[PDB]
């Protein structure tokens, strides 16, 4: 890194030299008028080179050699180690005329070398390495580098009704565990020469994205100092002489969104005082880049950790079955007296730390969710703005492109339909997360308009494969037609959930045509899913489903939607239809090793283990 340091006419120039740079010095400009040649002397820790246009010749400490003065003959000054005393190191140039061997004048350069390095964990191993060259850039992949920073959205101290990042304060030593470390490492004399200061700084744009902290008095009662962030764009650093390391704790405040890529930068500069009324000049600048970790969703294939359940006191039939199914599995259960519509359990991870984050958009919050190691982020709205109209596939590979965290699926309407669609802000937020490349399916053919009404995923136990379960109106009519022929014709359906029989349903011509159109809608999605998830007909199961068409021309479940089930590894919590429909579902799913359990019904939301795959090992599209 070449830096210009000109010699000033017959005068000494004193300057700070930052290690990692090298000086180019002009000696012709400072020479007196009539000077023909020049000579030089330099100290041991200053390699000096006389450069006569291209060719650079190294020069001895006390050389008596003289070179002709020319604007194309310059110097190249390089230092390798920091100074222990302010001046010490120097370059001296003597000037002579045509007839004379005693200097007619001399210009000097007194130097003070220091090392300045703003270091972060760019290699992603949890420890702040010394000056990673790739720290001023963020690259995706297992062979890529760049520091990662979480959003501090949990509540270490539960008194305040806001999250850790809503304030510009740190109250606990636990809060520092959710922060990324940034160390300012320096070497130099006891003090900086007169006219120099080191300043840490951020842009106005990045001020509502990061929060930089310092631990003052760490040997007794520790206090935490907010030095960069909201309304603090720069901070003057106290220079400690010799070999020093200043520890900083950086926090994220924003998730990547529409207009926020996720990348933030923190800079350090050595500013040189020129005069009063004039701004200090950044002589040296070192920068570090951080990527704010995205909010990631968890598919049904990931193992369950704990089941959150919301219902009423009278919902004892539901409560017993859900607890009996949760007993079969090796996971815990929580009760709350909207559950799968207003909240969703996701996670955030960094090389050092990782914890679950709940996204909540209420159409005040829920106490059983906010706390330590559990983030809680909160937000016109149609019925399509719901967490039921959101799904996430297991990891897929679609024509060479792997999606190791799956893909988010969102319900929508056809482009020229004029129908309902999720808000542009939600779609932009999920898209901005990048790691789960969202796909828009067609759910507007349903009265509610949710993708969980017609689809879901189940793993194949003891394998790393899964199945897409699709609602099928044709599967229902084929089952009915068979039972009607087998003698079960006048049998009453939904006995415990009108007086309807198979014969009555099959005779209803108008209902046949409605379900014919609804099967078309289901197959439109089946094609988008096979296309965007790399699925074949071997990976899909058709569960019998029946619908009724409202005045808007949309579907609404005739009997309980069996596809919206609780997936707890090999154990499925399927909604009871009120039984040949249950025996058909047991015949489709049970031979594959999936134990079915029909529930009476208000809903559930399962917190799962995050993926083994670290999101930063991915390589997403632009
Ligand atoms: C730490 N703070 C920050 O980083 C903030 N600066 C960000 C945080 C993210 N923000 C949001 N933007 C869009 C959608 C959001 C949803 C959300 N809400 C729903 C939903 C469910 C029912 N409704 C009616 N809406 C569904 Cl489906 C999906 C999502 Cl992501 C929830 C909660 C926050 C959202 C923007 C501001
Ligand atoms: Ca490291
Ligand atoms: Ca805090
Ligand atoms: Ca914290
Ligand atoms: Ca925490």
- The whole-angstrom separation of Cα 580 and Cα 588 is 12
Taking CA atoms only, the protein residue closest to ligand 1 atom 28 is 426
Integer CA distances (angstroms), 403 to 148, 395, 396, 399, 409, in order: 20, 6, 5, 11, 13
Classify residue 315 by burial, with Cβ atoms within 10 Å: 0-12, 13-18, 19+.
Answer: middle
First CA to last CA distance, the chain: 32
Output the CA 378–ligand 1 centroid distance in Å: 6
Q: Which atom of ligand 1 is nearest to the CA of 343?
A: 21
Integer CA distances (angstroms), 471 to 258, 308, 401, in order: 34, 25, 28
Output the CA 164–ligand 1 centroid distance in Å: 18
Taking CA atoms only, the protein residue closest to ligand 1 atom 36 is 379
List helix spans (H) across 424-561. Answer: 424-432, 473-483, 502-507, 509-533
This entry's atomic model was obtained through X-ray
Does residue 602 have an active-site annotation?
yes
Helix or strand holding residue 201 (H, E)? strand 196-201
Q: Which atom of ligand 1 is nearest to the CA of 428?
A: 13
Q: Which atom of ligand 1 is nearest to the CA of 254?
A: 4
- The whole-angstrom separation of Cα 78 and Cα 267 is 24
CB 83 within 8 A of CB 188: yes
Residues tagged in the binding site annotation for Ca(2+): 121, 123, 125, 127, 129, 152, 154, 156, 164, 167, 169, 175, 178, 344, 373, 387, 390-391
Burial 85-120 (b: 16+ CB within 10 A, else e): ebebbbbbbbbbbeeeeebebbbbbbbbbbbbbbbb
CATH assignment of 2-115, given 3.40.50.300, 2.130.10.10, 1.20.1090.10, 2.60.40.1860? 2.60.40.1860
- The whole-angstrom separation of Cα 536 and Cα 320 is 38
Taking CA atoms only, the protein residue closest to ligand 1 atom 30 is 426
- The whole-angstrom separation of Cα 242 and Cα 234 is 24
Helix or strand holding residue 248 (H, E)? strand 244-252
What is the sign of the dihedral through the CA atoms of 38, 39, 44 and 47?
A: positive
Cβ-Cβ contacts under 8 Å for 169 (sequence gap 6 or more): 224, 226
> Could you say which ligand is closest to the alpha carbon of residue 153?
1
Domain boundaries, the chain: 2-115, 120-292, 296-617
Output the CA 25–ligand 1 centroid distance in Å: 57
Beta-bridge partner residues of 344? 359
Taking CA atoms only, the protein residue closest to ligand 1 atom 15 is 379
Output the CA 61–ligand 1 centroid distance in Å: 66
SS3 513: helix
Say whether 120-292 and 2-115 share the same fold.
Answer: yes
Q: Which residues line ligand 1 (CB under 6 A)?
A: 151, 153, 165, 254-255, 257, 342, 359-361, 363, 377-379, 381, 385-387, 390, 425-426, 429-430
Beta-bridge partner residues of 469? 456, 541
Q: Residue 200: which of 245, 247, 236, 231 has the closest Cα?
A: 236
Tokens found for residue 188: 């130099």
Tokens found for residue 141: 């992949």
Classify residue 59 by burial, with Cβ atoms within 10 Å: 0-12, 13-18, 19+.
Answer: buried
- The whole-angstrom separation of Cα 449 and Cα 201 is 48
Output the CA 127–ligand 2 centroid distance in Å: 4
Q: Which atom of ligand 1 is nearest to the CA of 257?
A: 35
Q: What Rg value do the Cα atoms of the chain yield, rounded? A: 35
433 sits in the region (left: phi over 0; alpha: psi -120 to 50; else beta) called alpha
In the set 153, 311, 476, 602, the catalytic residue is 602
DSSP letter assigned to residue 486: I
SS3 395: coil
Read out DSSP for 316-375?
Answer: HHHHHHHHHHHHHTT-EEEEE--TTTSEEEEEEE-SS-EEEEEEE------TTT-BTTBE
CB 304 within 8 A of CB 330: no
DSSP letter assigned to residue 136: G
SS3 539: helix
- The whole-angstrom separation of Cα 506 and Cα 517 is 16
CATH assignment of 120-292, given 2.40.320.10, 2.60.40.1700, 2.60.40.770, 3.40.1390.30? 2.60.40.1700
SS3 609: coil
How many whole angstroms from its chain centre is CA 232? 24
Q: State the CATH architecture for 296-617.
A: 5-stranded Propeller (3.75)
């Amino acid at each position: 890194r070449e830096r210009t340091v000109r010699l000033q006419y017959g005068s000494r120039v004193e300057a700070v030299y930052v290690l990692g740079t090298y000086l180019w010095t002009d000696v012709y400009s400072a020479a007196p008028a009539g000077a023909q040649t020049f000579s030089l002397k330099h100290s041991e820790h200053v390699w000096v080179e006389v450069v006569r246009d291209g060719e650079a010749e190294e020069v001895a400490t006390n050389g008596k050699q003289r070179w002709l003065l020319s604007p194309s003959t310059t110097l190249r000054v390089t230092m390798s180690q920091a100074s222990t005393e302010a001046s010490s190191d120097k370059v001296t140039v003597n000037y002579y005329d045509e007839e004379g061997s005693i200097p007619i004048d001399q210009a000097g350069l007194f130097l003070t070398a220091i090392e300045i390095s703003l270091d972060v964990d760019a290699d992603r191993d949890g420890v702040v390495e010394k000056n990673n060259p790739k720290k001023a850039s963020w690259t995706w992949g297992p062979e890529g580098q760049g520091a990662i920073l979480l959003v501090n959205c949990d509540r270490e101290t539960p008194w305040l009704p806001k999250e850790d990042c809503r304030d510009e304060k740190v109250y606990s030593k636990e809060d520092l565990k959710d922060m990324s470390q940034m160390i300012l490492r320096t070497k130099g004399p006891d003090r900086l020469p007169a006219g120099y200061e080191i300043v840490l700084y951020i842009s106005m744009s990045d001020s509502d994205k990061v929060g930089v902290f310092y631990v003052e008095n760490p040997f007794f009662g520790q206090r935490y100092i907010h030095i960069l962030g909201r309304r603090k764009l720069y901070h003057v650093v106290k220079y400690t002489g010799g070999s020093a390391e200043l520890l900083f704790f950086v926090e994220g405040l924003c998730f990547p969104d529409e207009g926020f890529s996720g990348l933030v930068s923190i800079h350090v500069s050595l500013l040189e005082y020129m005069a009063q009324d004039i701004p200090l000049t950044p002589i040296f600048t070192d920068t570090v880049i951080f990527r704010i970790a995205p909010w990631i969703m968890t598919p049904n294939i990931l193992p369950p950790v704990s089941v959150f359940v919301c219902c009423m006191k009278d919902n004892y039939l539901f409560l017993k079955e859900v607890k009996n199914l949760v007993e079969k599995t090796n996971c815990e259960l929580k009760v709350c007296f909207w559950i799968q519509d207003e909240i969703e359990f996701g996670y955030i991870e960094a090389p050092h730390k990782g914890f679950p984050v709940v996204l909540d958009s209420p159409r005040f919050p829920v106490k059983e969710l906010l706390g330590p190691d559990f983030g809680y982020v909160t937000r016109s709205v149609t019925s399509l703005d719901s967490f039921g109209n959101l799904e996430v596939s297991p990891p897929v590979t679609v024509n060479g492109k792997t999606y190791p965290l799956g893909r988010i699926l969102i319900g929508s309407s056809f482009p020229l339909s004029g129908g309902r669609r999720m808000t542009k802000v939600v779609r932009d937020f999920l898209k901005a997360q990048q790691v789960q490349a969202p796909v828009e399916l067609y759910s507007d053919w349903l009265t509610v308009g949710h993708v969980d009404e017609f689809m879901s995923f189940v793993p194949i136990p003891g394998t790393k494969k899964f199945l897409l379960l699709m609602a099928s109106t044709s599967a229902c009519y084929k089952l009915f037609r068979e039972k009607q022929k087998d003698g079960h014709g006048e049998a009453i359906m939904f006995k415990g959930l009108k007086r309807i029989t198979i014969n009555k349903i099959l005779s209803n011509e108008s209902l046949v045509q409605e379900n014919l159109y609804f099967q078309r809608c289901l197959d439109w999605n089946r094609d988008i899913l096979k296309k965007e998830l790399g699925l074949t007909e071997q990976d899909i199961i058709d569960l019998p489903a029946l619908f009724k068409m409202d005045e808007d021309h949309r579907a609404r479940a005739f009997f309980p939607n069996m596809v919206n089930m609780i997936v707890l590894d090999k154990d499925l919590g399927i909604p009871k239809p009120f039984c040949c429909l249950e025996m058909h579902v047991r015949g489709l799913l049970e031979p594959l090793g999936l134990e079915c359990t029909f529930i009476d019904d208000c809903g559930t939301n399962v917190r799962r283990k995050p993926f083994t795959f670290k999101w930063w090992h991915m390589v997403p599209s632009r």
